[PDB]
């Protein structure tokens with residue numbers, strides 16, 4: 463039989479709106495990531511979606527057909543059980559420009575990524591570029607480019623686009639990134655994509671000597687309505703472990719924590735709690751490691767976790783020393799152009815007193831520029847940000863024409 467383990471690697475699925483990301487994830491895993499009513503109604507990804515699958519290989523069969531997502535080699539004639547390779551999971555990003563920030567949060571959780579371009583659309587589009595550049599900046603460079611919807615066009619049209627993609631990636635970090643043509647909707651050439659995932663998105667080395675840190679993107683509760691108000695199950699916090707590992711019954715804290723109001727005034731206090739359960743999808747475990755999206759059950763009052771209240775938080779061991787900053791210094795670099803914009807546009811230099819948006823881990827925060835130099839800015843934050851390490855990248859956005867657009871990036875200096 464195949465073992466029941468947690469996913470050991472996270473793969474982002476990103477790209478311009480409507481190019482078929484969620485359908486691609488479904489073609490691979492059998493799962494439709496959209497769980498919210500607004501998503502189903504509007505036919506769009508809004509919150510980060512998630513899906514897992516085992517990956518295995520039929521050792522006596524021919525590739526790529528030998529790659530399977532279930533323990534059966536029948537499809538290639540063998541009666542032998544396929545060799546289990548690993549369990550993987552997908553972080554399904556929204557393509558809509560207005561949801562760029564969400565993509566950025568998701569990118570903090572990715573070990574690698576798939577960029578979806580549509581074969582029946584002109585390359586390249588605004589969020590094709592924006593997501594590409596974001597991936598580069600954040601360091602998600604184990605990339606596969608998927609040419610989706612090939613069922614819609616002839617082979618020569620798809621090839622013409624392929625040439626365009628090669629031209630675009632040339633002279634960049636992605637020059638040798640593979641391009642794999644599929645039909646997500648009708649499930650064509652999906653096995654070449656599995657093969658490509660095994661070849662180009664290896665499970666990263668996980669440094670065990672690192673303190674446990676989890677980035678939070680979800681929070682909620684498994685409390686069915688009508689449940690007795692003093693028999694309620696504790697709050698659940700969802701996210702991804704980016705370093706170290708967590709274990710059931712560990713004492714943890716949520717940083718910055720909860721918003722405290724004294725009269726008018728607003729401060730933040732760390733939320734201390736204990737891990738009551740660890741869950742990956744539908745399976746329970748005794749420990750949680752990087753790779754996958756984990757649901758950490760706690761003893762917290764459900765009202766503290768309801769409706770993704772803790773999005774952007776981090777979780778650490780109770781006694782970890784973690785700076786929670788209302789002011790930050792960033793060693794920065796601006797893009798030449800606002801890549802996410804429909805019309806070509808130059809990036810204006812940072813100006814004192816202007817409001818910027820900062821993506822740090824899974825958090826998104828507005829701040830006012832208090833100092834500008836050539837290589838560094840200092841920012842006064844509207845809400846504090848937990849900074850768990852010395853080498854954390856931030857992505858910098860500016861509001862242009864009422865739209866938050868990525869304009870640069872930097873290192874948060876402590």
Ligand SMILES: Nc1nc2c(ncn2[C@@H]2O[C@H](COP(=O)(O)OP(=O)(O)CP(=O)(O)O)[C@@H](O)[C@H]2O)c(=O)[nH]1
Pocket residue numbers: 478479480481482483484485486505506507508555556557558610611612613614644645646647648
């Ligand atoms: N012909 C064809 N249509 C496809 C293919 N993949 C997806 N589509 C269609 O494109 C539309 C959008 O699919 P969806 O998977 O929601 O794309 P998405 O990129 O996740 C949308 P969002 O960016 O808002 O998250 C759907 O009508 C879907 O059936 C394909 O391989 N071929």
Ligand SMILES: [Mg+2]
Pocket residue numbers: 483484485506507554555556557
């Ligand atoms: Mg989608």
Ligand code: NA
Pocket residue numbers: 490491492514515516531532
């Ligand atoms: Na599967």
Ligand code: NA
Pocket residue numbers: 788789
């Ligand atoms: Na301050």
